[PDB]
Design a protein around this ligand. Structure first.
Ligand SMILES: [Cl-]
Ligand code: NA
Ligand code: NA
Ligand code: NA
Lengths: 206, 186
């Protein structure tokens, strides 16, 4: 007997400046929605558009592929929730893809001990960018941070790696096991989640 | 020596972009946080009329000489509003120190970037027609209004537009560095 409560578009994020997705949640304290319709228009156009892809981002999502995504242009979007009894509209959301960039974690993190001749031995860390980021043209710029700690230490040690995809750490505790992770952010935007940890045993003769 | 110029230009652009973003956030949180300023920002930027690439493919379609000259026109067009932003704010008896400080550095750093870009154009395209055309900003009376809400809205829009154009110029310069120096193998 109730129309839906007021929905809310609570997040948008772009993993690479080329596509983005947004997510909404149904309001509580209304009836169950049988359909949602997300519509939007853009700065400087009057045309209204519907969400072009309700599938790719999973449940309650709108995914904007490359042909629908641009930078430096405000999207003004809203989602309506409807059932047989009535309908309800979210607040309008103003979104610029420029400001919601958050990459996926770096890939292929690998760690090694290297002990060369009368040069300090070191831990050698290596990784790769997330896939589908276009760094080679300079369209995207990625910055990386490493963290590492032994089990039971109260603090992580953090190392800024800038734009490198390998790094050397010198002051390790001989004999200790370390958990190592890596994360990345665009030049301007949000840090990714940390990658899955890799583990390394530092040998005794360090 | 292209590589030193490009590295310096990109340091300056990335630094300006970051400062403009922090300035806009501080102004937003202090003066506009609760209100419909964002709705009045829509379509308010003096550089909108310019034909600018809006995604990677459009950027890739734009030849380098037009691309460089695009960046230069954008930067030249911001000299006037940045000068008046700093003048207007510095002449207020109780100016926000964190806001004023950023505006003054963006004003001085934008000049240095434009000087680097003029050097880059002379090295890479030594015989272009020296052609000055860029969009005119003329929003000074609105920064000057006695109405506090109209005033803060005009400032909001200028700082929103500055955050956008600085990010954009930084991104275009990073693309061009990769294209010109590295054949798109950064
Ligand atoms: Cl973050
Ligand atoms: Na996406
Ligand atoms: Na959906
Ligand atoms: Na696109």
């Amino acid at each position: 007997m109730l129309p839906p409560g007021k929905p809310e578009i609570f997040k948008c994020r772009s993993p690479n400046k080329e596509t983005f997705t947004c997510w909404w949640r149904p309001g509580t304290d209304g009836g169950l929605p049988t359909n949602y319709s997300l519509t939007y228009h853009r700065e400087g156009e009057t045309l209204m558009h519907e969400c072009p892809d309700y599938i790719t981002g999973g449940p309650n999502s709108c995914h904007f592929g490359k042909q629908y995504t641009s930078m430096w242009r405000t999207y003004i979007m809203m989602v309506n929730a409807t059932n047989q009894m009535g309908s309800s509209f979210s607040d309008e959301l103003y979104v610029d893809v420029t400001y919601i960039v958050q990459p996926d974690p770096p890939l292929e993190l690998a760690v090694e001990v290297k002990q060369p001749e009368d040069r300090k031995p070191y831990l050698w860390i290596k990784w790769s960018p997330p896939t589908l980021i276009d760094l080679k043209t300079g369209w995207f710029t990625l910055l990386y941070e490493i963290r590492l700690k032994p089990e039971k230490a109260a603090e992580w040690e953090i190392h800024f790696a800038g734009q490198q995809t390998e790094f050397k750490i010198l002051s390790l505790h001989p004999g200790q096991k370390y958990l190592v992770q890596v994360r990345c952010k665009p030049d301007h935007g949000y840090w990714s989640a940390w990658s899955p940890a890799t583990f390394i045993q530092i040998p005794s003769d360090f | 020596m292209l590589r030193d110029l490009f590295d310096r230009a990109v340091v300056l652009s990335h630094y300006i972009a970051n400062l403009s973003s922090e300035m806009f956030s501080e102004f937003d949180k202090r003066y506009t946080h609760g209100r419909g300023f964002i709705t009045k920002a829509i379509n308010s930027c003096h550089t909108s009329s310019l034909a600018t690439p809006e995604d990677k493919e459009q950027a890739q379609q734009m030849n380098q000489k037009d691309f460089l000259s695009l960046i230069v026109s954008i930067l030249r067009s911001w000299n006037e509003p940045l000068y008046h932003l700093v003048t207007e704010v510095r002449g207020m008896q109780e100016a926000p120190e964190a806001i004023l400080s950023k505006a003054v550095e963006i004003e001085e750093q934008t000049k240095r970037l434009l000087e680097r870009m003029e050097l880059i154009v002379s090295q890479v395209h030594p015989e272009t027609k020296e052609n000055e055309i860029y969009p005119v900003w003329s929003g000074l009376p609105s920064l000057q209004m006695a109405d506090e809400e109209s005033r803060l809205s005009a400032y909001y829009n200028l700082l929103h537009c500055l955050r956008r154009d600085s990010h954009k110029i930084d991104n275009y310069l990073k693309l061009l560095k990769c294209r010109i120096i590295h054949n798109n193998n950064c």
